[PDB]
Amino acid sequence: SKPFTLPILTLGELTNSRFPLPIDVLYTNPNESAIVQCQNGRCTLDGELQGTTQLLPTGICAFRGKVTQQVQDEHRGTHWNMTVTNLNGTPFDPTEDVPAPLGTPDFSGQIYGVISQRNTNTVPGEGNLPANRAHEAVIATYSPKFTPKLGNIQFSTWETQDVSSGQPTKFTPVGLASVDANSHFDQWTLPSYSGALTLNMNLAPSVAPVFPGECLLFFRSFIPLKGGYGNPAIDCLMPQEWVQHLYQESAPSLSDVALVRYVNPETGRTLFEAKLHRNGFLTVARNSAGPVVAPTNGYFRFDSWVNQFYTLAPM
Amino acid sequence: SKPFTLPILTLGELTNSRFPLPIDVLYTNPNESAIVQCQNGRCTLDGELQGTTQLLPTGICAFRGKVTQQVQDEHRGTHWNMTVTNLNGTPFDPTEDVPAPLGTPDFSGQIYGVISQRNTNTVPGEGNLPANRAHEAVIATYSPKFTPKLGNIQFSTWETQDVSSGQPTKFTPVGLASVDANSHFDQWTLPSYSGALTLNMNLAPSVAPVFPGECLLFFRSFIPLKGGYGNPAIDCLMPQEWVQHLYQESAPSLSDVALVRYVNPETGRTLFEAKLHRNGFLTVARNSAGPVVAPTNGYFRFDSWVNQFYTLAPM
């Protein structure tokens, strides 16, 4: 077969697969009460992308489409209805066996970013060039108007008027607007991709430890905020570079569980070991929550294929 | 000898190494009069990063640092000085043999994006959490105040007051503010990294065809605009995924030129051939400017190492 490998990129050379951020730390939270079932950063060890996962770092939490309607807020701000396409610009076919267009955000929150437009029509007197505009925007993924699987979403602006209808529109994500209670930030709560009364479909499966004393290991990034108090984070199961690597290699999985070692390349010693599961997630034997304190030169190296009964050395 | 390879990611699966954008099209411009000497997306075929190149898609045209104070400036908007560090947070050492902190923009223009801050100090009443803010911002890289090699740059905001002194600060690039004449957009004009009148140092070398009938081949992306007319583009020599791949493989270069073929896998046929040069750039035999019209599912396949005499089939 084709032997299994991971990239040799270090922690400071990896990026988050659920938001466009660098990886900051490795992280555990054994007492997590939520089901973990994120939809971006999902890839099996033999290279099958799942959920809404696509390969571009620029596509994570991105949208493309056109604005169709302006609707003022009751109190403050303006909302804009947007039809969405696939990120490559082709029409999104809701019968496609995916939860939503690839790259769609996979958590509840107010996602802050920039909406930009480049008009289709050009002006001969301007050298056959189009008009443009961009503004700060927020997409509330818990909104009843957040229906990307039906091909449409809503975003809000503080801008009151300068958003054009019928013109190509791009959303570049930047961070969150708020993590106040009213902003419903919960990184493990999936949006209702078709609206509140409708079941999500075609999901990548939930992940969990199955061996006693094990917990999930995450690649954690801190996410910027537009305002208010907080130090919010987004935890992914594998960095985007691992998704890209696994997709290209398509190495056969020889068992359900690979043993991997986090190594310090200077010393060559194993700092700790982890189980890398077939569905594309890590567990470790750790009985505590918080960051993993590790040498900056550390990375994961594949050791061998094991099974669910393998006992990891405690962290 | 570790065999040289390229990723099998397709054009719609690649991103630009000079700005955080997807690759839109392959592109030539044989009569370009400028010297081509970009500093991001620079990597030799045997995996040596050059210029200001680093590995993170999130690091391209990003800055990290601290705002010092608001500063006076004749130009429109409110202006702020910020110290800059390495992207990993360590102090930037100007004695390092690099032109500027890795990730620094490599072109003249008004770069539009978002400045965000997460305060160092936390508040007990807020659950021991820090205050945050973010605002749109512009960095004019041709400004005499743009001195990233000296550890200091300036940015402007529309916001008049809500940027805090002495707090951790991130710049997330989004596009350009303008491409009007007065905004000095020129993708091949390097910033003066240490200020007006100082010579840049430690640069990746210029690149050019050296064979009659040949021209540079670029991976082109269109860049968003905050306002104004235009359809500006940023051309890179190799996409970021190629930089990431070459860096990791570190395969010995067996000649100065790798012959590659652009293949349509669905049909299995070669669309055209190109030379991939040791310093990390492509040439083709083409006598016109403009996009290359071909499926976005096409990709470059390494064929063989060739010598200084090899003649490319015309596109």
Ligand SMILES: CC(=O)N[C@H]1[C@@H](O[C@H]2[C@@H](O)[C@@H](CO)O[C@@H](O)[C@@H]2O[C@@H]2O[C@@H](C)[C@@H](O)[C@@H](O)[C@@H]2O)O[C@H](CO)[C@H](O)[C@@H]1O
């Ligand atoms: C949307 C807007 O106009 N923002 C300005 C406003 O921001 C503050 C309000 O949004 C407020 C509503 O209760 O929430 C605050 O969180 C927010 O301020 C932001 O967060 C606080 C904790 C501080 O870090 C502020 O610096 C930050 O902006 O009001 C502020 C000034 O208080 C600014 O004008 C915002 O532009």
